Design an enzyme around this catalytic site. Sequence first.
Site, mmCIF file in Angstrom:
data_model
loop_
_atom_site.group_PDB
_atom_site.id
_atom_site.type_symbol
_atom_site.label_atom_id
_atom_site.label_comp_id
_atom_site.label_asym_id
_atom_site.label_seq_id
_atom_site.Cartn_x
_atom_site.Cartn_y
_atom_site.Cartn_z
ATOM 1 N N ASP B 163 -13.190 1.183 2.088
ATOM 2 C CA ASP B 163 -12.325 2.098 1.868
ATOM 3 C C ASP B 163 -11.984 2.413 0.557
ATOM 4 O O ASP B 163 -12.400 1.580 -0.552
ATOM 5 C CB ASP B 163 -10.853 1.557 2.544
ATOM 6 C CG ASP B 163 -9.907 2.685 2.594
ATOM 7 O OD1 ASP B 163 -9.408 3.071 1.535
ATOM 8 O OD2 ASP B 163 -9.580 3.238 3.655
ATOM 9 N N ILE B 166 -6.550 5.911 -4.487
ATOM 10 C CA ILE B 166 -6.059 5.880 -5.889
ATOM 11 C C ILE B 166 -4.938 4.933 -5.825
ATOM 12 O O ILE B 166 -4.068 5.205 -4.795
ATOM 13 C CB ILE B 166 -5.875 7.364 -6.058
ATOM 14 C CG1 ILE B 166 -7.158 8.248 -6.170
ATOM 15 C CG2 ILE B 166 -5.210 7.284 -7.411
ATOM 16 C CD1 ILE B 166 -6.653 9.701 -6.088
ATOM 17 N N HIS B 167 -4.742 4.098 -6.879
ATOM 18 C CA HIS B 167 -3.572 3.205 -7.016
ATOM 19 C C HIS B 167 -3.502 3.152 -8.377
ATOM 20 O O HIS B 167 -4.330 3.167 -9.239
ATOM 21 C CB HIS B 167 -3.930 1.730 -6.443
ATOM 22 C CG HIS B 167 -4.131 1.607 -4.826
ATOM 23 N ND1 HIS B 167 -3.126 1.296 -4.059
ATOM 24 C CD2 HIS B 167 -5.018 1.810 -4.076
ATOM 25 C CE1 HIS B 167 -3.520 1.253 -2.806
ATOM 26 N NE2 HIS B 167 -4.845 1.636 -2.823
ATOM 27 N N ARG B 168 -2.090 3.008 -8.756
ATOM 28 C CA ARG B 168 -1.464 2.998 -10.113
ATOM 29 C C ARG B 168 -1.900 1.617 -10.705
ATOM 30 O O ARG B 168 -1.682 0.620 -9.932
ATOM 31 C CB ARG B 168 0.025 3.403 -10.266
ATOM 32 C CG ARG B 168 0.632 2.330 -10.063
ATOM 33 C CD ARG B 168 2.137 2.724 -10.566
ATOM 34 N NE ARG B 168 3.159 1.722 -10.331
ATOM 35 C CZ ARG B 168 4.093 1.469 -9.063
ATOM 36 N NH1 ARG B 168 3.801 2.641 -8.398
ATOM 37 N NH2 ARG B 168 4.754 0.532 -9.024
ATOM 38 N N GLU B 230 -13.680 7.109 3.059
ATOM 39 C CA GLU B 230 -13.318 8.557 2.691
ATOM 40 C C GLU B 230 -14.338 9.210 1.744
ATOM 41 O O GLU B 230 -14.152 10.254 1.741
ATOM 42 C CB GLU B 230 -11.571 8.553 2.110
ATOM 43 C CG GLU B 230 -10.650 7.932 2.737
ATOM 44 C CD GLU B 230 -10.487 6.473 2.467
ATOM 45 O OE1 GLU B 230 -11.365 5.861 2.078
ATOM 46 O OE2 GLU B 230 -9.286 5.934 2.821
ATOM 47 N N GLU B 286 7.153 9.307 -10.693
ATOM 48 C CA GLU B 286 6.673 9.422 -9.117
ATOM 49 C C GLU B 286 6.416 10.977 -8.788
ATOM 50 O O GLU B 286 7.037 11.660 -9.430
ATOM 51 C CB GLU B 286 7.329 8.708 -8.106
ATOM 52 C CG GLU B 286 7.321 7.239 -8.485
ATOM 53 C CD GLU B 286 8.471 6.465 -7.652
ATOM 54 O OE1 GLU B 286 9.472 7.004 -7.641
ATOM 55 O OE2 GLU B 286 8.608 5.251 -7.472
HETATM 56 C C1 LIG Z 1 -2.901 10.726 -5.459
HETATM 57 C C2 LIG Z 1 -2.038 9.627 -5.710
HETATM 58 C C3 LIG Z 1 -1.887 8.613 -4.628
HETATM 59 C C4 LIG Z 1 -1.416 7.474 -4.969
HETATM 60 C C5 LIG Z 1 -1.025 7.060 -6.007
HETATM 61 C C6 LIG Z 1 -1.043 8.147 -7.110
HETATM 62 C C7 LIG Z 1 -1.975 9.323 -7.099
HETATM 63 C C8 LIG Z 1 -2.151 10.098 -8.107
HETATM 64 C C9 LIG Z 1 -0.704 7.774 -8.520
HETATM 65 C C10 LIG Z 1 -1.903 6.923 -9.292
HETATM 66 C C11 LIG Z 1 -0.020 8.645 -9.468
HETATM 67 C C12 LIG Z 1 0.224 6.584 -8.409
HETATM 68 C C13 LIG Z 1 0.683 6.066 -7.062
HETATM 69 N N1 LIG Z 1 -0.454 5.902 -6.376
HETATM 70 C C14 LIG Z 1 -0.497 4.888 -5.379
HETATM 71 C C15 LIG Z 1 -0.861 5.427 -4.206
HETATM 72 N N2 LIG Z 1 -0.890 4.391 -3.047
HETATM 73 C C16 LIG Z 1 -0.506 3.131 -3.645
HETATM 74 O O1 LIG Z 1 -0.227 2.490 -2.537
HETATM 75 N N3 LIG Z 1 -0.214 2.844 -4.540
HETATM 76 C C17 LIG Z 1 -0.124 3.865 -5.409
HETATM 77 O O2 LIG Z 1 0.219 3.402 -6.711
HETATM 78 N N4 LIG Z 1 -0.892 6.666 -3.795
HETATM 79 C C18 LIG Z 1 -1.171 7.002 -2.372
HETATM 80 C C19 LIG Z 1 -2.567 6.867 -1.746
HETATM 81 O O3 LIG Z 1 -3.528 7.013 -2.883
HETATM 82 C C20 LIG Z 1 -2.682 7.649 -0.637
HETATM 83 O O4 LIG Z 1 -1.487 7.541 0.106
HETATM 84 C C21 LIG Z 1 -3.935 7.206 0.088
HETATM 85 O O5 LIG Z 1 -4.251 8.477 1.150
HETATM 86 C C22 LIG Z 1 -3.761 6.100 0.744
HETATM 87 O O6 LIG Z 1 -5.181 5.732 1.421
HETATM 88 P P1 LIG Z 1 -5.470 4.595 2.319
HETATM 89 O O7 LIG Z 1 -4.939 5.055 3.813
HETATM 90 O O8 LIG Z 1 -6.774 4.767 2.480
HETATM 91 O O9 LIG Z 1 -4.739 3.304 1.958
HETATM 92 MN MN LIG Z 2 -8.391 4.567 4.235
HETATM 93 NA NA NA Z 3 -8.118 5.261 0.832
#
Ligand SMILES: Cc1cc2c3c(c1C)C(C)(C)CC=[N+]3c1c([nH]c(=O)[nH]c1=O)N2C[C@H](O)[C@H](O)[C@H](O)COP(=O)(O)O
Ligand SMILES: [Mn+2]
Ligand code: NA
Lengths: 488, 488
Positions: B163, B166-168, B230, B286
Amino acid sequence: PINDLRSAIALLQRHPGHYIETDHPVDPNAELAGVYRHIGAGGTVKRPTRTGPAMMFNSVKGYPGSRILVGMHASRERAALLLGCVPSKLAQHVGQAVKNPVAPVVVPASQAPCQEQVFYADDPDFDLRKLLPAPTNTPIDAGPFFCLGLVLASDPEDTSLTDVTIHRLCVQERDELSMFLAAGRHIEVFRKKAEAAGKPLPVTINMGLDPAIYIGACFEAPTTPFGYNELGVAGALRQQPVELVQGVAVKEKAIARAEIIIEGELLPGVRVREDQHTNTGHAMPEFPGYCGEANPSLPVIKVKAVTMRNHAILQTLVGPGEEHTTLAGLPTEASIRNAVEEAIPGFLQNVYAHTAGGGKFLGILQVKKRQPSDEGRQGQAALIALATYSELKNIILVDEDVDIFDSDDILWAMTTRMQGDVSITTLPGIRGHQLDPSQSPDYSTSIRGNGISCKTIFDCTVPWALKARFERAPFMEVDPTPWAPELF
Amino acid sequence: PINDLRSAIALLQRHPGHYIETDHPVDPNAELAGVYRHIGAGGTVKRPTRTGPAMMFNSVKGYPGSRILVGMHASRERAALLLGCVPSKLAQHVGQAVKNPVAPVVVPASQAPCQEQVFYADDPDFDLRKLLPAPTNTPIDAGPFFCLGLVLASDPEDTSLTDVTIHRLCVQERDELSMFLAAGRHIEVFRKKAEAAGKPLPVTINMGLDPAIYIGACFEAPTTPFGYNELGVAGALRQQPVELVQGVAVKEKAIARAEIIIEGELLPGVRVREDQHTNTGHAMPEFPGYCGEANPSLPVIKVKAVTMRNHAILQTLVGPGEEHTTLAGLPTEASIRNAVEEAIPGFLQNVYAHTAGGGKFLGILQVKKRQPSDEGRQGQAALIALATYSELKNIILVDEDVDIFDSDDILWAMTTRMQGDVSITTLPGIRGHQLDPSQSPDYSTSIRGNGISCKTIFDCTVPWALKARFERAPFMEVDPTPWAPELF
Ligand SMILES: Cc1cc2c3c(c1C)C(C)(C)CC=[N+]3c1c([nH]c(=O)[nH]c1=O)N2C[C@H](O)[C@H](O)[C@H](O)COP(=O)(O)O
Ligand SMILES: [Mn+2]
Ligand code: NA
Ligand SMILES: Cc1cc2c3c(c1C)C(C)(C)CC=[N+]3c1c([nH]c(=O)[nH]c1=O)N2C[C@H](O)[C@H](O)[C@H](O)COP(=O)(O)O
Ligand SMILES: [Mn+2]
Ligand code: NA
């Protein structure tokens, strides 16, 4: 120093983007409106559309030497440029104008550029339809229209009381126009007194004016009640009494510095069907964005003379789109701001008669809660707005950190600062406006007749107790210019 | 043919207005985001802001030789160019790609520009905080952040299940980052499994990618269920498999043509407070436009190596503003479009995950009622949207003559095609999203806990029986170009 339309144009040319000309031939029947639809009509016009420059069509098919100007008021920034303030302060700038009018002043005919050419209608070859190119907006219009005809009439029993109003005028014959007056219109009070005595009412139609004159004229009661010469709101915007001329053929005055004057009389007892020569069933587009139906019984103006400048500009509008938003919306904003400031001083920060409502149906109120007791006053401001401008339909309330002129930011407040089962108040069965087609018993069982509506208040202000949790994310305050100089 | 970030930049330079550079030094701490706030952040960012060019800062104070790019996805028009279709058809184009994924392939290091430089963390002089600039958004951020860190991880029981999300990531030490994983995230499933076994989870953080990869990654279940890699979406968008490479220090694959790669391991048992070094109490802005609170307990990534191209670009974002709207909103639209088209073929014309909801909270559905039986289906389409994307909050339904990407036109439909006591349906007590601060028991007594909402459907479609009365004023079809070539 702007005193008329040509001086106004001169200023627009010192601000690139607000005025363009074209020499490519255009047909005033439908095609002109079709072109400006894409260029600067804006407002409620069916997309694609945008706001843009005011546009001068210099080669009019069938009318050499004529030139048609549209879109002069079709932008809030342009209106602000023409009036000399910043667009966010038009509500306040116009608000202070209506409350300090300056009466107009009569001038001899030698100082009246409008009378540089005179065409009397008693000439056997006179034909209004060949003399000026009255454009049509849609192919299904009732006929050729003048849409920025500022009509000037007076009480036939009290000459002292004069009213000026923009009315749509359909060219019907070589020396005749029809004119639509809604119920309770202020000039209609004069005509009905004239018609009831079997007398015609002399009028002048003034076209191609200082933007200050058109804007100041579009107020309604109770802000400018019956007996308030709307001339002078312009006089307050310019700090200058607008100049009047005595008509060359009717017992009525005309605006001396206008581009084109049509002198005539409203005839007693006469009525015509607005689309009598077209049978389209439609008048012209209305400000909500739909086609108005052809009025079956309209009074007639018998033209006695047409009077115009050398190389006269025919000014009209298209849409009516954003041009109507400006003309109707800034009086709307001024009225609401004056009323809320009287009832709750310091609370209302700004108001926007949104272009999505044509400057009449949708009011955006920007309030600032300064103390615990201000909670609950946001709804009070909405009530004041609805009480002041009865043709409003919906109110959206937002805080001072929301840009009420940015529709994305408005939807943002409606998305993160509202709960549907908390923030939405509906008021069924209140009279609104005939031209909203959803104000019909066929749309809702709570609507008893046409032009009655449910009115809705969307409270998108942060509850007072929660304000510390709703601060928008702050960014370091920088000057971005060095990193992108060309972007200013 | 785009297959990485620099081929994408090359495309933007052929469309002027979409990419600019600057050599004026900028501080990655707060100052950089402050500049781009005025230039291209857009979205829910505190005004004043706008969309503009993607922007490259060539001179980064404290990091000579480094260059930072922001705003690559911060424009719907820019996104459509990088994907190779028209912006109005993104929902259909991305929708078909997620239904027909193309699986990634492994390539040797010789075809992985991401590995042109290798920096091992076990060097005594290695320091993540000196090696890469990690910009902050606000002066009150928890610490240096990487905001476009696409994390790649696999299941410890089955390495074929990969999988990407994007995570911060906050830079905490010379070799440690904190990672926030929301509950239910797919990589979190992998992480909880490894920690339950007392074992680390190998991860790669891939930064500076083909825009197709970032966009394609932001799908959620049910559209991309647990097990759906993805990266297959990006492969379908390019008709070219994403190329993976073996990391240098961890047992996980990395994106071969990325710009910067951080290889690391999620440590079992270790937790850290996000703002341990600043104590600001905040994380970062956020997507709804408010500042998030610091997370008191986050897993940490122990950095094993960093792996870069020569003159590598560090790509991140600001706002997150319009960049988040694009990244989350295009999959949201694609997910909704696919669901409605499967259930009601031919009915849904388009969908816009509005930027006012950061691409998640507000859905605009454009439908076309073709027959009497389509009456009542507009509400069904809203239900399908709410059932497909549970983090939606409100739905606005409009007809095919409303431009759903024009917020003015949306508010117009909400004004002339809506009656408050008819067209508004509220659904209380539905789980929504934690980051909407109005989803709180303090805002509404029908909300039992944080992140539960009233969800509201605004039906602004013309009732079927009334459609002939709601035709927008028809303007003549013309090509406006000959009357103003400069403006086309
Ligand atoms: C676009 C985007 C999506 C973030 C995101 C950010 C962005 C720019 C940031 C970098 C600005 C800050 C927060 N982000 C996080 C995040 N999800 C999460 O769990 N923690 C996060 O910190 N997300 C949401 C996550 O990327 C989406 O919900 C995915 O579709 C989850 O996919 P998954 O089902 O495979 O886990
Ligand atoms: Mn996924
Ligand atoms: Na994902
Ligand atoms: C700005 C504007 C206002 C029009 C208007 C137009 C515009 C551009 C047109 C020309 C595009 C189409 C219709 N117009 C008519 C109209 N009122 C009316 O009774 N008949 C009309 O034909 N109005 C509304 C009217 O002018 C305003 O409500 C005035 O404030 C009424 O002034 P009063 O109270 O003194 O009568
Ligand atoms: Mn009046
Ligand atoms: Na009047």
